């Protein structure tokens, strides 16, 4: 009841939130939605790397809002000398990351570098894209 001392013991909706810029202030800093494009030729490898990255993020108390994959680009190349075809494919997989304070980002980058797999490439940049 309202007049009782127990009022609002059932109140739960303030415990849930049922409802982007880069804020670089002065002593407290945030990069805005960093997309980590993992480009590679093996489908498996990139995925594995992405997974690892995600896991790391989870461990480090960092949000992972989106983890989509980009389409596979069929770069059909003629091996000129006798036309020998080689239909290679490049696969891009992304892992978005929001909040990050001064000291952490560098460390994260270092970790990524340490972990980099064999024949896979990075690109860390802002969200403003068109899929």
């Amino acid at each position: 009841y309202k007049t009782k001392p127990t009022h609002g013991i059932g109140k739960y909706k303030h415990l849930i939130k049922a409802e982007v810029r880069a804020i670089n202030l002065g002593t407290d800093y945030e990069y805005g939605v960093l997309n980590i494009h993992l480009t590679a030729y093996d489908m498996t490898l990139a995925e594995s790397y992405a997974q690892y990255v995600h896991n790391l993020c989870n461990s480090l108390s960092i949000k992972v809002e989106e983890s989509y994959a980009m389409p596979t680009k069929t770069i059909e190349v003629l091996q000129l000398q006798m036309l020998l075809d080689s239909v290679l494919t490049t696969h891009e997989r992304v892992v978005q990351i929001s909040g990050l304070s001064a000291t952490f980002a560098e460390i994260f980058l270092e970790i990524i570098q340490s972990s980099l797999p064999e024949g896979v490439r990075l690109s860390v940049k802002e969200h403003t894209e068109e899929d």
């Binding site: 490898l45 340490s114 024949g119």
Partner: protein, 45 residues
């Protein structure tokens, strides 16, 4: 720590065979790749 995400199995169920292909781009750098058929070498121009 470069071998942590290297040991990769194909997590999909229905798929083709894959062989340890040595791919070489114009930098002069080999890469282990899973290209169609057992092509050991595929040097890129």
């Amino acid at each position: 720590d470069s071998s942590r995400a290297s040991l990769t199995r194909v997590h999909r169920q229905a798929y083709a065979r894959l062989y340890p292909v040595l791919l070489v781009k114009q930098d002069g750098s080999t890469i282990h790749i899973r290209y169609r058929e057992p092509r050991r070498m595929l040097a890129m121009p």
